[PDB]
Structure formats: structure tokens, C-alpha cells
Amino acid sequence: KDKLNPPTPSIYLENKRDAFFPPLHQFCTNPKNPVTVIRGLAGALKLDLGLFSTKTLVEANNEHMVEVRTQLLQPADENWDPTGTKKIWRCESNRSHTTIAKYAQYQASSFQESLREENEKGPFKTIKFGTNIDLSDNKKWKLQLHELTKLPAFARVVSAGNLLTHVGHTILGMNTVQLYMKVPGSRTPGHQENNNFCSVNINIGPGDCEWFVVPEDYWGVLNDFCEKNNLNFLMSSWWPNLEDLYEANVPVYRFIQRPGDLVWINAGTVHWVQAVGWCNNIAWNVGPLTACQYKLAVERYEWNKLKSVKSPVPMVHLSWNMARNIKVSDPKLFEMIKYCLLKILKQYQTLREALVAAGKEVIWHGRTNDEPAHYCSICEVEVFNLLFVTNESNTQKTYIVHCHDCARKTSKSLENFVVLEQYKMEDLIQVYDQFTLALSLS
Ligand SMILES: N#Cc1ccccc1O
Ligand SMILES: N#Cc1ccccc1O
Ligand SMILES: [Mn+2]
Ligand SMILES: [Zn+2]
């Protein structure tokens, strides 16, 4: 069925008017569009993609760290076992580290070597992919990061309407820029984004990338394929067999991203990518203030706890920041936030009361302003308000945080721990009570 190979939602920009046009924002965030390809974006803004050329990067910071993935160079859209016998989901991707200057040398000699071959089942060649390059430092990358402020507000790394701007601290690769340096065949295996946030990706060129996209609501089916093939959905590297997806009636969006094209991956959308030519890419995340985005973020946050995986985004901390600082006028979104806050409040109340009733002292610790969120030093769960710290760490003021469960596993009556309280109970109740539905006529 041609319904299993649908057309990709696309917008063709000509000029700055088209880029700043408000229905473009609304199209991208529509939950019915699992992906949007904004074609011609860089040319429309006169973005200087040369600021991200390999030549410019080498001159800017030649020793900057690059994470290298070594992979097999595979035919078209397929993934074969390394003996060339059968197509499988597991794809090998070994890790090491190099510098921008060393990868640059490989990328250039890779192309020259391919030129010479042009002019003059396996087995498969091996290639190297430069990934997760950290462009967070404003001093090191001044002109690069400035160029990205030319984007329309909804797609920027920082903006008033971006939930990740409201977290209150740096989450590397989410509210900072990541760079990728590629050769043909360089593959990003199947995944969803961290805590299901949207992603923005611009191809620097000169070569193309090819993208595969599956809607969020089919993720359970892909999870099943993984487990059936002895792979973890969240932790392992997998490359879907398209004939398996087709036979299971999963629709796959498939398209080419050319230099200057911006790809918007909507919340929770499952995707994997390969370079067709030689190119660089930049990417980051964004969180639109919609019900769909809040729901899918919370859902992945909770799924991560069950799977013993850490959440990079502290949704409890973020939720209180939303109630404090953002006017919310969508009734469905408002009710979601209100529900989540009321649950948090009740959990906190129940724990605090059990502690007091057990004759355990709750020690006022207060909070420094603009202080970030905290996680459990053992299990890496987010920990909110009530912190559990050993007697010794308390005295030494190294205040190492534990969650309640981990402290109790180690010290059965918490006799080895102090309980620190950051937020006055009446504060939290106030913030909650103050938070009401705003009127918008839009
Ligand atoms: N090699 C290497 C490396 C790994 C993590 C962070 C910085 C590095 O230079
Ligand atoms: N419980 C516990 C514990 C473990 C290492 C050091 C100090 C402690 O209170
Ligand atoms: Mn991605
Ligand atoms: Zn813990």
C-alpha cells in the first residue's frame, strides 16, 4: 500500500517573509505532522553555512574533541550481517575519540580517494563518522552561534517560548548545539530524542543526507521488533529492516535533506539517518508549549524510571518553573500541568509526614536562587525538595544527594542520613494555588 510510503510534509521557502511567516511555526508543531522538511531555509535567510565548513572549523579549534563511530559501509537502505548472508536489525558502531583536525584529514582524503576510484552480500568496507561535537562554548564559537540567532524565534536554541530555555541550566546537546562531520555511509541508528523533545537539524552540505521517519504511535511495534531480535530499544544500536516494517504495516516517511534544508523532528517521532554524500550537520532540541509536547515528555520521563535510564530533562523542576513563570491559556495543557503538580505535592506531603511521625528530623536547608535540579548519586533519578545526605557529607558540607529509596536500602532506619528541606511547604502550595488558566482569544 502506498499509504505505507506517504509523502513528507514539506515547505518551500523563497525569502525572509516566508521564513518569518507565523503559519510556518504552527505547521511544524501540528501533532499530525511527524516531521516537517523546511526546504531552502538557509538561502532564504542568507545564512552563511561557510561558518560551519570543515576548513573554518579546523582554523577555529583544531584540537576540539570529536566522538568517532566506526561502522560498516552498507548498501542503500539495508543492513546486512557482516558475512553478507541475511539482513538483520543489529548494526555495529564502535566508539573512540579524535580531534577536529584529525577527522578533517580523514574526511578530505576519503573524498580524494573516491575521486581516484571513480576515474580509475559483501564484503563491506569500514567507515568513520564524527559525531556529538560540543559547540556550547560562546568564546570558542562566537561567530558560529551568532549566525544561528538569524533563525525565526521558534527554531532558535534559546527563546521565550522554548521549554528548554525554562529549565534553568545547561543540558549539553539539548539547549546547546551539536555538530556532526560525515562521509558517505555515516549512520545515525534508530532512536527517539531525549525525553521526546522536538529536534532541529540543518545540513551544512555540500553532500546530501537521507532520512527515515516513523510516527510516535508506532513505537511500541518497533520496541517489539527490537526485543524479538535480542536488542534494547533505548540502549542498543539498531537499523530497521524496511521489509519487516512493511510486512507489519508500519508507514515509513522517507526523504532527502539537501544543503540549507532544515529538518524539524516533531515530539516522540522515531527516526534514523544516513549521509549519501560528504557533509557536516548541526542540531539541537526545542520544546514547544503544547499539550502534545508536555504529555510525551512526561511519558518518556516515567518510562525511563521503569527502564532504569536517566532523564536529561528534570521534568519536576521544569514543571514548577512553568507554573511560576509562564502564562498558560490552552485548557488541555493547563490541566496536564495542574494534575502533575498536585501529584508531586501529595507525594511530598506523604513522605514528609512519614518522616516526622518516625521521629526523623527535617532540617531546613533553604535554596540558593537560580539553583538547578538534582539527581540521585546512586540511581540517577531526579530528586525534588527533600534531599537525603549522609551524616559525614553533611558535616563536610559536600552535600551529596541521594533519593529516599537508595538511602533506605543502605541505612534501614536512615540513622546514617540527614533529611534536608529546600522548599517551604506553604511556598509550593502558594505557587500551585496561584497558577490559573489564562485567557487567550487566539
Ligand atoms: N579521548 C578523549 C576524551 C573523552 C572525553 C572527554 C574529553 C576527551 O578528550
Ligand atoms: N549508609 C551509609 C554510608 C556509606 C559510606 C559513608 C558514610 C555513610 O553514612
Ligand atoms: Mn535525532
Ligand atoms: Zn536513588
Strands 417-421 and 362-364: parallel
HSE, side-chain direction, 13 A CA sphere, residue 293: 23
Q: Which amino acid is at 404?
A: H
Interatomic CA distance for residues 211 and 240, integer angstroms = 13
Q: Which of 62, 63, 64, 65 to mutate to test the pocket of ligand 1 (most atoms within 8 A of CB)?
A: 65
Q: What is the resolution of this structure in A?
A: 1.8
Question: Looking at domain 358-424, does it have CATH number 3.40.50.300?
Answer: no
Interatomic CA distance for residues 277 and 363, integer angstroms = 60
Note the CATH architecture for domain 291-357+425-442: Up-down Bundle (1.20)
Q: How far does residue 57's CA lie from ligand 2's centre (Å)?
A: 47
Q: How far does residue 98's CA lie from ligand 1's centre (Å)?
A: 8
Tell me whether residue 191 is annotated as binding.
yes
Please name the residues in contact with 123: beta carbons below 8 A apart, sequence gap of 6 or more: 84
- Integer-rounded Cα radius of gyration of the chain: 24
What residues pack around ion ligand 4 (CB closer than 5 A)? Answer: 376, 378-379, 403, 406
β-strand partners of 420? 363, 387
Contact predicate 207/277, CB 8 Å: yes
Strands 178-182 and 126-134: antiparallel
CATH superfamily of 1-290: Cupin (2.60.120.650)
Measure the N-to-C terminal CA separation of the chain; round to a whole number of Å.
39
Tell me whether residue 279 is annotated as binding.
no
Please name the residues in contact with 401: beta carbons below 8 A apart, sequence gap of 6 or more: 374, 375, 376, 377, 383, 387, 388, 389
Interatomic CA distance for residues 297 and 401, integer angstroms = 24
Domain ranges across the chain: 1-290, 291-357+425-442, 358-424
Q: Which approach determined this entry? A: X-ray
Complete edge-to-edge strand list for the sheet that includes strand 362-364: 362-364, 417-421, 386-390
β-strand partners of 198? 286
Please name the residues in contact with 264: beta carbons below 8 A apart, sequence gap of 6 or more: 28, 35, 36, 37, 38, 155, 198, 199, 200
- 15: its cell numbers: 525569502
Q: What burial class does residue 249 get, using C-beta atoms within 10 Å of its C-beta: 0-12 exposed, 13-18 middle, 19+ buried?
A: exposed
Strands 262-265 and 10-12: unpaired
Interatomic CA distance for residues 306 and 229, integer angstroms = 21
State how far the alpha carbon of 114 is from the alpha carbons of 74, 107, 121, 153, 277, in Å. Answer: 16, 11, 21, 40, 11
Interatomic CA distance for residues 172 and 174, integer angstroms = 6
Tell me whether residue 28 is annotated as binding.
no
- Tell me if residue 403 falls in helix, strand or coil: coil
- 199: its cell numbers: 529536534
Interatomic CA distance for residues 280 and 275, integer angstroms = 9
C-alpha dihedral over 45, 51, 55, 58, to 10 degrees?
Answer: -150
Ligand 2 pocket, residue 10 CB under 6 Å? no
- Tell me if residue 401 falls in helix, strand or coil: coil
Q: What burial class does residue 287 get, using C-beta atoms within 10 Å of its C-beta: 0-12 exposed, 13-18 middle, 19+ buried?
A: buried
